[PDB]
Amino acid sequence: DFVGQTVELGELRLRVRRVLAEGGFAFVYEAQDVGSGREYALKRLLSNEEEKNRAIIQEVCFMKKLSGHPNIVQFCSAASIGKEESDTGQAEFLLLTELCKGQLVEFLKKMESRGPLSCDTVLKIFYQTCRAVQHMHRQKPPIIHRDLKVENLLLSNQGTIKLCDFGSATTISHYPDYSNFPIGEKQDIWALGCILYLLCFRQHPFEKYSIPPHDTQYTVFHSLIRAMLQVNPEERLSIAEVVHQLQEIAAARNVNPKSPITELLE
Amino acid sequence: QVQLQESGGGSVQAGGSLRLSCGASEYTSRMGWFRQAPGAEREGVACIHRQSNLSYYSDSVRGRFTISQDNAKTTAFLLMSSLKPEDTAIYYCATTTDCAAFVERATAITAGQGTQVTVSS
Ligand SMILES: O=C1Nc2ccccc2/C1=C1/Nc2ccccc2/C1=N\OCC[C@@H](O)CO
Numbered sequence A: 001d002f003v004g005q006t007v008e009l010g011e012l013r014l015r016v017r018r019v020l021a022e023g024g025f026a027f028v029y030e031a032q033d034v035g036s037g038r039e040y041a042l043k044r045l046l047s048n049e050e051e052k053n054r055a056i057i058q059e060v061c062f063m064k065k066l067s068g069h070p071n072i073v074q075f076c077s078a079a080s081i082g083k084e085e086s087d088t089g090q091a092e093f094l095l096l097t098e099l100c101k102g103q104l105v106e107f108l109k110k111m112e113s114r115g116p117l118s119c120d121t122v123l124k125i126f127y128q129t130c131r132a133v134q135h136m137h138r139q140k141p142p143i144i145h146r147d148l149k150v151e152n153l154l155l156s157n158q159g160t161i162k163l164c165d166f167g168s169a170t171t172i173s174h175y176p177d178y179s180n181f182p183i184g185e186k187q188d189i190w191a192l193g194c195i196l197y198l199l200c201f202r203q204h205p206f207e208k209y210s211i212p213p214h215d216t217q218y219t220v221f222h223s224l225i226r227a228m229l230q231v232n233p234e235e236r237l238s239i240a241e242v243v244h245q246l247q248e249i250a251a252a253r254n255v256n257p258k259s260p261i262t263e264l265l266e
Numbered sequence B: 001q002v003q004l005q006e007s008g009g010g011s012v013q014a015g016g017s018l019r020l021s022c023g024a025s026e027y028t029s030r031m032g033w034f035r036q037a038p039g040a041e042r043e044g045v046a047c048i049h050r051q052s053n054l055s056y057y058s059d060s061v062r063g064r065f066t067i068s069q070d071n072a073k074t075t076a077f078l079l080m081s082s083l084k085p086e087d088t089a090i091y092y093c094a095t096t097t098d099c100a101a102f103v104e105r106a107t108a109i110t111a112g113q114g115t116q117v118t119v120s121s
Helices: A050-066 A104-112 A119-137 A185-201 A219-228 A239-252 B099-105
Strands: A006-009 A012-021 A026-033 A039-047 A075-081 A091-097 A153-155 A161-163 B004-008 B010-013 B018-024 B030-036 B043-049 B054-057 B065-069 B075-080 B089-095 B115-120
Touching (some): A012 A039, A039 A050, A050 A075, A050 A091, A119 A185, A119 A219, A119 A239, A185 A219, A185 A239, A219 A239, A219 B054, A239 B099, B004 B089, B018 B030, B018 B115, B030 B065, B030 B075, B030 B099, B043 B075, B043 B099
Parallel strands (some): B010 B115
Antiparallel strands (some): A006 A012, A012 A026, A026 A039, A039 A091, A075 A091, A153 A161, B018 B075, B030 B043, B030 B089, B043 B054, B065 B075, B089 B115
16 A cells, blocks of 8 residues: 555655565555656665665665666665654665666567567577676676576666666675685576576576577577586686677677667567 | 697788697686787787687687687687788787686786797788
């Protein structure tokens, strides 16, 4: 019973239009600035515990830092209310960002009934997902996502991929402003490998794995999947190594992989 | 340290072809070449990821060089075609933990003693 209310968030006045998503910790809402008419996604996270407080605030800090990238949702604002002040009896964290058109899976469900995903479209989805992850790995220190999966990805109004779930992300605090050691990036690449496999073959590679032996549609990706699913993390590709090859694939197919994925929009 | 053994290079006429080779005393996941022209920064040129056979080039040499390896994954080969004075440099074999980083910065685990490549017009 949170929809219908108009909520202050700094000098923004926002009417809570409807529920886009739910789950455990949080709800996400479509909201509209009453004054300007502008639309946003508003994530409300409720907390009764200090540990959840830390998790929530860390997720917001991550979103602030990573905002500004084409493939990360744009952070607009955030605010809180202590327990003394809310109609939940709980700590309330409000996160405001750009509003996206929908979850990626919803669009995948609809394309599913029009054949297998075009290789070009898989390329655009994956490249854009990988550019977001590269943006996290390029931070000094690198930000590790740790829960990459296709369900968490969104599609923006402009038809590009947007990463939105930073609640499992981690990094090193108080890093001097020398080390060039791996610190978890490679787990992210494994997760990405599973996404590429999934997007191509519409199932998870594990429940050892096996690329379908007579696939002639997604052949172009086969070596990259295997390379990203190296058991040995030192042998596994970095995101720079993955993105490099994704650009070469793109060139080979004469595709702009950063362009709007307009095949998902029809 | 792995022990590297380098061959090939020397002088060639512009537009021609040279081949370099490099042998490692044991297996490594990635092998490449960087070069250094006079006064310039080190420049990652080409790199191969052995288990995948995937290969990485700098913008300067893509389309003209091809890096490849032997079946035994002990050696890399660099075929350099359509060579130009810009490609005059000392070329150093190297191992790396990351071919894309290597191609961008020449960050290496260990490097060979180098071979001279000179291209005359
Ligand atoms: O436009 C959006 N900006 C955001 C910023 C943070 C979290 C979610 C969203 C979001 C969403 N826009 C839409 C539109 C339709 C359905 C769901 C949905 C969204 N987020 O859904 C959150 C679920 C995801 O986190 C799965 O783990």
